[PDB]
Structure formats: C-alpha cells, structure tokens
Amino acid sequence: QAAITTTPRNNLNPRSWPAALVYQESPAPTTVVLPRDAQAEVQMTNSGAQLAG
Amino acid sequence: QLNAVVDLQDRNTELSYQLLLDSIGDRTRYFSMWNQAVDSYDPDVRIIEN
C-alpha cells in the first residue's frame, strides 16, 4: 500500500509540495455567449425607442 | 427587472379609455360592477325650456 498510488517522495517527509500528480482539479471554462445583445441596443436607444428585455 | 410602465405624465392613458368605449356601445347603458352610466347632466335643463 506504501507504493501502490503513494508516488514515492524525494525526502521521506517533505516541507512544501509541488503541483504534479497531487490531483490538481481543472474544471472546464463554462462558455455562454450573451444574455442580451450590445450591438442591437445601441442603435435604437440613441435614436428613439426605450426597451426592457 | 422589466418596466412596462415608463409612462410619463405627458401622454394620455387616463383619457385613452374614454373615447374608445363611447364608439363600441354607448356609455349611457346600465351596469353592475362598472360605473358605466355617464357623468353627464340634464340636456333639457342646461338649455332652458322656460
């Protein structure tokens, strides 16, 4: 059990640990486009109509 | 947080209802809930039949 998943260390009890093979979680960038459109809003509000979407 | 009431005091919303209802069925008619019968006068009194 001391060699199964342990990953043997340089000094048998270290001080400050690195990042390699100590399970550093990377949750993927959650990508959403836009709730409202910026380009569709500028043209109307400066010339005339007021909105709420 | 929408706003369908950006309604300013300039336009008519109070007066909008009045002239449209007068065209469909005349306002003089008797009703229950609605205070439909018009806030008018007596046409034979304002002009004298003396």
From Swiss-Prot, chain A:
The lineage of its organism: Viruses, Varidnaviria, Bamfordvirae, Preplasmiviricota, Tectiliviricetes. The chain holds residues 58 to 110 of 227 of the full protein. Structural component of the virion that acts as a cement protein on the capsid interior and which glue the peripentonal hexons and group-of-nine hexons together. The modification Phosphothreonine is found at residue 7. The gene is L4. Transmembrane segments: none annotated. It comes from Human adenovirus C serotype 5 (HAdV-5). It comes from the Viruses. Coiled coil: none annotated. This is Hexon-linking protein-N. It is found in: Virion.
Swiss-Prot record, chain B:
It comes from the Viruses. It is found in: Virion; Host nucleus. Major capsid protein that self-associates to form 240 hexon trimers, each in the shape of a hexagon, building most of the pseudo T=25 capsid. Assembled into trimeric units with the help of the chaperone shutoff protein. Transported by pre-protein VI to the nucleus where it associates with other structural proteins to form an empty capsid. Might be involved, through its interaction with host dyneins, in the intracellular microtubule-dependent transport of incoming viral capsid to the nucleus. Homotrimer. Interacts with the capsid vertex protein; this interaction binds the peripentonal hexons to the neighboring penton base. Interacts with the hexon-linking protein; this interaction tethers the hexons surrounding the penton to those situated in the central plate of the facet. Interacts with the hexon-interlacing protein; this interaction lashes the hexons together. Interacts with host dyneins DYNC1LI1 and DYNC1I2; this interaction might be involved in intracellular microtubule-dependent transport of incoming viral capsid. The chain holds residues 354 to 403 of 952 of the full protein. It comes from Human adenovirus C serotype 5 (HAdV-5). This is Hexon protein. All late proteins expressed from the major late promoter are produced by alternative splicing and alternative polyadenylation of the same gene giving rise to non-overlapping ORFs. A leader sequence is present in the N-terminus of all these mRNAs and is recognized by the viral shutoff protein to provide expression although conventional translation via ribosome scanning from the cap has been shut off in the host cell. Induction: Expressed in the late phase of the viral replicative cycle. The gene is L3. Belongs to the adenoviridae hexon protein family.
